[PDB]
From a paper:
[name] (MARCHF6 in metazoans) is a large polytopic membrane-embedded E3 ubiquitin ligase in the endoplasmic reticulum (ER) that plays an important role in quality control of cytosolic and ER proteins. Overall, the TMD of [name] can be divided into the three subregions: the N-terminal domain (NTD), the middle domain, and the C-terminal domain (CTD), which are formed by TMs 1–4, 5–10, and 11–14, respectively. Our study reveals how extended hydrophobic sequences at the termini of substrate proteins are recognized by [name] as a signal for quality control.
We also note that the N-terminal RING-CH domain (residues 1–113) and the loop between TMs 2 and 3 (L2/3; residues 242–463) are only visible at low resolution due to high conformational heterogeneity. As a result, the TMD itself contains two sizable intra-TMD cavities each surrounded by TMs 1–5 (cavity 1) and by TMs 5–10 (cavity 2), respectively, and both are partly continuous from the central cavity. Our cryo-EM structure shows that both cavities are occupied by lipids. Interestingly, cavity 2 is occupied with a triglyceride in addition to a phospholipid. The conserved middle domain of [name] forms a lateral tunnel-like cavity, the entrance of which faces the central cavity and is open to the cytosol.
Author numbering: 113 to 240, 463 to 522, 544 to 1052, 1095 to 1145, 1166 to 1230, 1264 to 1293
Amino acid sequence: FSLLLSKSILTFFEKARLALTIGLAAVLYIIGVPLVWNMFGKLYTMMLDGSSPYPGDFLKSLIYGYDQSATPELTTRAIFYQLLQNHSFTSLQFIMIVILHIALYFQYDMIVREDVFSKMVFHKIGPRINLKLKLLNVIAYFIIAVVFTAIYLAISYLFPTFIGFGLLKIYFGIFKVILRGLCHLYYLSWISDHLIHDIIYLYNGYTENTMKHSIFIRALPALTTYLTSVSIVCASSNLVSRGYGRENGMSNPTRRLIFQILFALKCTFKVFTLFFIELAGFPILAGVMLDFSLFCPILASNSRMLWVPSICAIWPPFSLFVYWTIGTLYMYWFAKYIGMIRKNIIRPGVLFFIRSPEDPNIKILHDSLIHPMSIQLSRLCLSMFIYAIFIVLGFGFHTRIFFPFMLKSNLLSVPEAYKPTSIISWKFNTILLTLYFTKRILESSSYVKPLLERYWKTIFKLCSRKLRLSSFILGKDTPTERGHIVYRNLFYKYIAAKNAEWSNQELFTKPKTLEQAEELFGQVRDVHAYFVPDGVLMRVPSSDIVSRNYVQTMFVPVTKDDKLLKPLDLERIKERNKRAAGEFGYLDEQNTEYDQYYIVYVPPDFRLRYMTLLGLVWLFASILMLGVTFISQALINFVCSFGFLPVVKLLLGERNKVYVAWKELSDISYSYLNIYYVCVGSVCLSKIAKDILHFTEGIFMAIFNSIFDSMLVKYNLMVFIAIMIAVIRTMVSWVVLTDGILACYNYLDESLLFVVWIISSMVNFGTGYKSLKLFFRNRNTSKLNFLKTMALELFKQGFLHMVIYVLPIIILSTRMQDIYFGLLIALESFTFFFQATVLFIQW
Ligand SMILES: CCCCCCCCCCCCCCCCCC(=O)OC[C@H](COP(=O)([O-])OCC[N+](C)(C)C)OC(=O)CCCCCCCCCCCCCCCCC
Ligand SMILES: CC(C)CCC[C@@H](C)[C@H]1CC[C@H]2[C@@H]3CC=C4C[C@@H](OC(=O)CCC(=O)O)CC[C@]4(C)[C@H]3CC[C@]12C
Ligand SMILES: CC(C)[C@@H](C)/C=C/[C@@H](C)[C@H]1CC[C@H]2C3=CC=C4C[C@@H](O)CC[C@]4(C)[C@H]3CC[C@]12C
């Protein structure tokens, strides 16, 4: 036994050495390194200002720094809270810096690898003791990390901030000169005064060093230095490229490499800016207007203007994540709607400007490199403005200017008692989970989308037929749409429209011009209406995937036989193409595989007609959404006020808390908006959708699938079970030790009990990590297999441990004292002996 006993002691020593090396390295690299970074940042800020926030005492200065806590005390608890906050701040800064560097390097690599980038470049320049040893390493690496952090923070914050002071003083002087010139030109109280006050406040805070806490006012000099450096790089690329071209070769190799680097950086910044806008600022601003128009008037008061900032009061930066999420969700749903319309309802070619999700001729990087930044940015701005019109007008009208004022109704406003106030609150979480589960149920159903598509087909056909846009929007039109019916009198035009139409028996048989129609009205009294053809046939693109050059030639009027009514102005088209392109126009090679055109009829006043069509689309979408919402709410309310509530009144009583809660909920629902009722009714109508489809031409299973099949619920449940089993086994272990061995020893210092509790907690967190390992193995398994595996694991490592140790003690709890204590000692000794025997057998 002695030989491999000593060997096992050596293995335990190796374990302990490895555990200590990992633990010390982890604690240092996770705590000290962010704290060393933050202390160096505070020291550099003090050097820049020249004075510490707390003169003389540098610890408090290096602990609290430039914070708003008024004279905080040096309490160990206060110190711990402050250091946690400092660690969070520095972790956020480091994460942001690392992400920015990674994104920029990836953009640089992708652009450099691109072949069209090489073509652009060629166009511009033209052709040519062991434990101790390990620890030593850990400490040495930590010292290297600390000195690297000091140097990097120096070169990245200290010097940039000083150069920022200089450059920002220069720019303030230049701005002052420009303002003086503007005032001279000009010469030769609530809103503006408030804005002037805010700007003067910011300027005084920066210049007089009063705002020492603001992140923005501290980063202003460094940000100015970085922006100036970027501007210099972008301008110097063009400056180096001056003169040289495809004809004038650039012989010098060093200058060639310098330009290659500068141009790569310029393209990196251009593509990064465009992508950052389109992917963050586009969704974030869309979410901001969604908050302004829909969420704030509904989940908050109409008087307020934004709602997400209030619920993100815990950590205001999370409002950006919330805004991005809601904006991205809105854009995804709008893209789905446009996809449905494009797929089935409207003519293929109408929505050519909107980007087609399934387009083989998509080269995002190539287009970002070649097309000028101004043109792409302008297209983004107009698309953003159109999305703003849709969001703000379409939702905010109903939520702000229609229901509260015209109808004087709170039917589109959550009741005061159920308005969420914080993101972590139960109200917000319940609303969000209800919406998520209902969305999952609706998407899972196979009859909702079809019915919706049929509704939109009917709506589009009706609106287009009314506006005489059937040919342009749908592709099929009767000849009656190709002219307006001129009536003799306004009475016949409006009051007697049907009578006047019936009077003319030659209306659609023969076309009459306007002057001829007036002449016939003057001559004859029997007929008071005639058909006057108007509008001209036009060429329109026959597919959504059409080269941008083709679009510039495919909106020209034509005769019946595909002959242009006016000779095409080719030179103007070429000039517009040159403007739409840039120095790199020829490099773009647009594919003409899908460049075909339809000859469709376009009525007069086309712009007004399709604007009215979009207005009618908004009107009918609003009618559909409001009808679905209110029908769902009314259906559930009728079911849950004339249905279950009387039953609860009989069974649960008339004064029970549950009965009062649901009764008040229903009574408010008759006048307010309950999202829960709306969602449940939406599920019910989704079920009725099949019957609706059949006539016009299970529930619990679906709910179960949607709930217990989503990855969110699975992850939440598995984490909950892991925590539960860990805490259960910790309670078992602590109770066993204390109310067993300790009590028996006493029969025969909180610090020690907390220490052993920590040890048991660590070992049982390892036990829980065993279940976490089970999670990954069973992540994709079926619901029944998942539930059975989870139940067996929980049972065995939970209630089995419960029964083996605690329950006999439960039952067991003069000679009877001795019997009790001896029996408990014997059972503990038997368990210890069994464990030791198993370990010895394995050994
Ligand atoms: C960059 C702009 C695109 C923005 C992307 C996001 C917008 C989402 C879709 C909204 C469509 C409405 C915007 C119309 C803008 C037309 C710009 C253009 O390039 O036109 C050139 C063309 C030609 O204009 P022209 O007749 O002046 O001729 C110009 C001739 N050349 C090219 C030689 C100079 O105009 C059109 O073809 C207009 C067609 C509009 C058809 C409308 C389809 C309705 C179907 C419903 C979809 C909308 C659902 C959302 C509605 C919800 C309301 C709340
Ligand atoms: C205000 C300063 C101090 C920092 C600003 C950071 C924000 C603008 C953050 C908050 C949420 C971040 C977004 C959170 C997550 C992602 C997902 C990511 O998605 C993809 O890259 C898709 C790629 C593919 O699948 O092809 C794009 C960046 C983005 C939106 C981030 C962009 C930057 C955002 C908007
Ligand atoms: C205003 C310009 C013309 C003058 C003053 C140049 C200032 C230099 C010091 C600036 C301009 C660009 C800055 C710069 C660019 C890129 C990086 C990489 C990053 O990972 C750390 C910061 C670091 C290393 C900084 C250091 C400071 C630089 C080099």
